[model samples]
Target: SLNYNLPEISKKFYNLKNKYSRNGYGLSKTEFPSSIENCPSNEYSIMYDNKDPRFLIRFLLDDGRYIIADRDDGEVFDEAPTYLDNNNHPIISRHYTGEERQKFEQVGSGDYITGEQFFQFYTQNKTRVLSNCRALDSRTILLSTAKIFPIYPPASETQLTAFVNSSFYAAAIPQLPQTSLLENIPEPTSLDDSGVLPKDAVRAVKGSALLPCIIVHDPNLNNSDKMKFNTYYLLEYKEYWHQLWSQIIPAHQTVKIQERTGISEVVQNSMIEDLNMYIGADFGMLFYFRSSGFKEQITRGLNRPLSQTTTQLGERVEEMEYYNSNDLDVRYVKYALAREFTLKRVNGEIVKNWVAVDYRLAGIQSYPNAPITNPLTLTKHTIIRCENSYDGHIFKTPLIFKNGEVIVKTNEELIPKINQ
Candidate 1:
């Protein structure tokens, strides 16, 4: 029952569309060097996964790889990125190029709109859409009509959904109302007391108190086995919910709940025991950022319920659309997206970064985590300056894989003790 209308950045929808898809479109089939080179004749196509019509289409090579598009930044991502994020488009990672990454390569005379161009499917022209693409490593651009088709998932996967209680530790933050008294409760402003949100700025007239809730229904109080986005915390809460209902509801009341349109308001207070427990736990340490986390809220309709503004680039942000309960598995958007993450707890460590210089400056062999090609390496450099030093050593930049011995420029961590 949610708005299945794909958002402007419909990567989630794209993934869903492709999950069970069987067919696609290309920039008119072009042949590349093969037999002699033994390369799989490259294939070009405009792939789909959501949007008003045109969204990030895939530049998939029949070799089973794909790239992303923006115009100038498209790099040939080695492994077709299989996942995306809820916020920023995918970030590239090393070995991890590895992260959501890619575009295409063109030596010359040109480039294109892998997802750009006089592109996008027009409703009237249903069979095919035309767009420009560049010949990989060459100087030519392509202008061809492409189309899309669909298939996937062996039945049960017909629909996939994840359940997360709004308390995704607050990481799953929904867009707050245009103005809430909460922002300035302690200050004296709005007339006399605290600064108030002008009545004109409010988006809702009443009943804006929506609590954090996840969808879980056998069409019942609820349950699921294949929810990719759910958490153990939800299981704990729901199990308690059913047990309590069984104990509290009389036979007559049970029948009422059994009714098709029955509704029972549940005033929950799971933090009841945290009052005393809070004294010892530091709240300051509980938070993270968009760039650093493995798990994140992907369906953030930030520019919603207001005017839709366009960014400097073609980044289309728009008004928020609400979803009905039945739409949970629709996945027009990711409740939260994620991947395998690694970590190192070093509160007392000297982490060396590659920031001071151009990230690409640190070449392979010489650098610790340098890549076979970077895109990911360069990306890692772009996001983080220094590389973490496991052995606490600094090194000179290398001479492009020719030599790799570089570590510890001069040592002076100023000393260490307390315990070896």
Candidate 2:
């Protein structure tokens, strides 16, 4: 009997099968650069390593046209072409040596051809083959492969036509709705319930000062009533000047007041004052003044005799005439009540201080006859003054419009008297 370790030999065969089988074959994981820029290259040579034989072979082909076959049946190439012709076509050989031979042994033996060579060989031999063997068109012939060998029979006309038609349809697909260009939308002529006012009204009110007021309806008392209404008052500029002459001191001083009146000239001229009582009663006021002109003389509340003179030759007398000198200091003051507070330095340390108050208090007094619900409401006022026609001082004070009436009597109480 020839019973010579058959079980042991069978075990050996099973081990070899597991060592090379799909699941058993230990594949070394690897990655390749997709872009040529990321690929490593130098002047002499460019090379990359990959475990995926399919990707390596596909990369060698100029066009992405190739066949995939099992490593068995000797259908895959043992080696790729090492050299290229002028047109980038692979230069094939029946044999190789050195590194090429080593690579070929490591890969496996197979019938290998570049895309260009495959097309050329198939085109030349396609017509020579019998019609039954010619199953696909010339282009499709090079693309298809069989299992036993890499070469496949020609494709039929129906199958080739269907593939071509389907490809054409896919390439001619219409653009998606999201990818289409959007249409233009026209701009609205009127926005939100408001339109442009009359040209005459705009022209008349352009340069004029205005005051805004809001009126609300009693909606709870009457459901049919609508709330929220806006009203505006155009103001007129009042021109005035006041003069103070010191008779005993023989000095003259002049003051000019330029202020916006509460009365709107437009309301008065249009005979619409009766429509709203507050229209002509609201004012915006600003005050500024100068001391004396070149010919005029004013005292600075102090005197220094420049020179003494004698009248004729009879007697020596001191001239009482006030002669203004270049060094004489002139002062100007601006005052506002109900002023706002701001940060300032006190005793070399930073602290909160009053700056200038709101100008609204000065203007609000013009509407005294209007309804007044609050009397003790305090408004901030600011006072700005300059000495010797130079930057002087700034301070703030609280002001109240008593019974909605504007009064100058309480101004002295609000502001401290500075150097005369």
Candidate 3:
């Protein structure tokens, strides 16, 4: 008969240090100091097990309510009887009967309650409940100090040994060097010479190739030198970048030409007169001044007596600014001017108003004229003027309201004007 090989197995106990001690299994009693006075009303509370120091017990209240102990060692009461099934799950009497079950269904889990209902319930019951309870001190422990002993499924000797061997082999194998593994890998041809980078390169480098690559490639550089290089490179790069960008980006330039001929003569002759006549018909005195010779025309058109004094009162150019817009081949330019004036009306009451005028002009660079091209020409002047009270009062109106919605009162108007 041949001798058989039998594997020998031995049993041994491994002791692990507790989170709080070098030899203890778990936390000390001080770690979870129990307070009967501060026990929760409707939540589970872990209590000290009288039979065993290492274990804990949970007490269930029959009334579905818990009272804080008046004394540290006060007696607890169970007004109603509570029974448990074979599985040790308590069956509340309120949810036992068919009518009670229907009521429970109607009330659901009682998660959603109105503020009024909550307030009424608290007024009627919460004070009575709190009056019976005593406040107790409690403190939370660090999560690191909480030791958790996991329960694993039981295994046969063969399976246990195999698992131990496998774990040992897995940990025993030498880890491959990360750089050594990537050393044989080739540089990506996908980044080949257009000088332009791929989306992957831009994303991996965080929108630039130089920053991420330079850090990894030159890790030995001093912080001061690195910062100096970064600043110098960025300055040079941006200078060249903006220089190239200016040529690629679309731009517009407005050149105002002094009218040496026809339109200037017409504007100087009667444009102010036309404006003054329109203003007179529309019920206001028009006062105008220009860089060219239009003041005499305006004075004559308005029929105003000029009082030439060293001190001029109550009239001034309040503000002036330029506005421009470009669309297709046409460019628009306007010089906006605002003036404040106080004048006595026919009723002899002095009224103050701000008058804003925009002197608008347009240039057409390209236009078809019988298949012949015309050079850039400035269009005739267009003036727009509006008057408003000097106080700058704006009107706002309310629109609509929806049920259960909050509406905030605001000074801003509901409907906005196109120009505004």
lDDT of each: 0.18, 0.19, 0.19
lDDT (Cα, tens digit) per residue for candidate 3, span 1-420: 111111111011111112112222221123243344332222122122121112111111122222111011111111122222221111111211112111100001111354211100011122211011121112211111011122132222111111010000010111111111101101112212122121111111001001110111123444333222221110000000000000010123333332111112232224233222112211233333211122232233223323343221221112211111222232211111111122222222322222212111111111221123222222222112223222122223222212112222232342232235
Per-candidate RMSD, Å: 28.8, 37.6, 34.3
TM-score for each model: 0.18, 0.14, 0.11
Stretch of 10 with least lDDT, candidate 2? 163-172
Clash count for each candidate, listed in order shown: 27, 21, 0
lDDT of 1 by residue, 1-420 (tens): 112222232112122122122232222112332222211223332321122121122332222233332211222223223222221111221221323333232111111335211113211123322122222222122222222322122232211111011111111112222322211111121222222222211121111111111211112112222111211111100000000001111111111111010011110111211100000011111111211121112112111121122111111111111211221111111010000001111121111110001111111121111232111111100111212222122222221122222212132121221123
C-alpha positional error of residue 179 in candidate 3 after TM-score superposition, expressed in Å: 82
Best by TM-score, which number?
A: 1
**RMSD after Cα superposition, model 3:** 34.3
- Candidate 1: C-alpha RMSD to true structure equals 28.8
lDDT of 1 at 182: 14
